[PDB]
Amino acid sequence: FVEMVDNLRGKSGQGYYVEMTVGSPPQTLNILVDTGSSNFAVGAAPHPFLHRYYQRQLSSTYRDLRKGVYVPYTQGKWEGELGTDLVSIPHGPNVTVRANIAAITESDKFFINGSNWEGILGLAYAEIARPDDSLEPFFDSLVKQTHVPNLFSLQLCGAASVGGSMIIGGIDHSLYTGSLWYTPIRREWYYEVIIVRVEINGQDLKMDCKEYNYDKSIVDSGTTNLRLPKKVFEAAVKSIKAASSTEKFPDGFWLGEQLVCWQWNIFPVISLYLMGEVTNQSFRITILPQQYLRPVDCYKFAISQSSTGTVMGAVIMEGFYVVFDRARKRIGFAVSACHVHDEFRTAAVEGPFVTLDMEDCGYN
Numbered sequence: 001f002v003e004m005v006d007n008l009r010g011k012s013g014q015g016y017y018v019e020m021t022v023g024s025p026p027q028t029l030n031i032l033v034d035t036g037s038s039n040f041a042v043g044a045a046p047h048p049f050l051h052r053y054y055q056r057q058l059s060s061t062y063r064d065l066r067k068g069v070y071v072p073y074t075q076g077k078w079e080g081e082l083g084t085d086l087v088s089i090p091h092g093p094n095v096t097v098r099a100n101i102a103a104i105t106e107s108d109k110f111f112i113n114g115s116n117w118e119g120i121l122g123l124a125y126a127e128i129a130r131p132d133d134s135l136e137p138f139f140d141s142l143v144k145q146t147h148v149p150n151l152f153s154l155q156l157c158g159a160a161s162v163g164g165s166m167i168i169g170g171i172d173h174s175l176y177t178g179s180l181w182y183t184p185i186r187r188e189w190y191y192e193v194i195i196v197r198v199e200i201n202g203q204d205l206k207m208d209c210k211e212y213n214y215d216k217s218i219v220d221s222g223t224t225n226l227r228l229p230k231k232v233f234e235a236a237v238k239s240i241k242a243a244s245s246t247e248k249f250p251d252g253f254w255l256g257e258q259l260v261c262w263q264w265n266i267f268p269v270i271s272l273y274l275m276g277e278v279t280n281q282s283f284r285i286t287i288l289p290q291q292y293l294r295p296v297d298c299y300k301f302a303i304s305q306s307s308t309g310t311v312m313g314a315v316i317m318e319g320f321y322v323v324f325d326r327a328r329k330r331i332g333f334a335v336s337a338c339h340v341h342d343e344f345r346t347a348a349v350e351g352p353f354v355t356l357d358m359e360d361c362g363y364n
């Protein structure tokens, strides 16, 4: 899988993207990798932010599905025309598949001014696809039409340019150290998982664990921050405040509404315990402040409250090598060979632990 190593690029806080080709002859586009949506959607018109876009008129393999699609999400929207065409990933497996493609013809707050990507690859499941679950997502199409195994994995390496690896169809053992630990995918829509316990510098928050997954917890490469449900964020902040009370900071800062500036150890490690593979067994992943204090001297608090549930975004994923094992309905975590650490503290994946009543932590 060596040709796939380092196939991801990006700029700080504008996501990670992979090179793809669409149409015949192939048209090259940079596409955002998003495990929190399920559509393959590409710029199709000369929006001024775009370096390039899908020109359906140049493709002999393009086919129109004669149907529109409308996608508002919390922070913007896109709209487009559905079709299919031949798709491939140059620094991915050596295969060409016919996939659904949303030709984006109108958007708001979707494309980023200054960014070097022109589309979005939704790697989540059919259920949250638009307009409905019959629009087969890319990865489903990929697996159905080839012998590429039903899994992919992500090493998001962070820092300004970021880099990483999307290993399609397998696992590359050089990208991680120690053992992979697997949490079950509770349901195949988003990559939903269950958090059963939360610790700040070893101190259990002691909240009903139902709170950690109200109304869900997901693993999402298209979100920068670790996002925590309101009640839990509050409780978590209060403990980061207490733990880090060596210095003081404004209330805006904790809300991610102002920065703080200097010219690490005052801040606690954060630990999430995830449901394991066996009854009454968990494991924990541990991240550093290096992961949740983001460079904007100046820094942003990369943890924020949420109304949609826990989102394990880039802040979490940059610590680890993450295996989206769709074949076995599970997600694996291991310490990333590329993650950024002190020579004191370190990102960690440790287990097994004993946790009772893990099923009660899920929300219905």
Ligand SMILES: CC(C)(C)COc1ccc2c(c1)[C@]1(COC(N)=N1)c1cc(-c3cncnc3)ccc1O2
Residues within 6 Å of the ligand: 013, 014, 015, 016, 032, 034, 035, 036, 037, 038, 071, 072, 073, 110, 120, 128, 130, 220, 221, 222, 223, 224
């Ligand atoms: C329909 C649905 C399932 C409710 C969600 O559909 C969606 C539809 C469109 C869409 C998303 C979700 C997002 C928003 O969050 C994620 N994961 N992708 C997203 C994130 C980014 C982005 C990532 N990283 C840094 N900066 C920006 C850019 C565009 C973008 O567009």
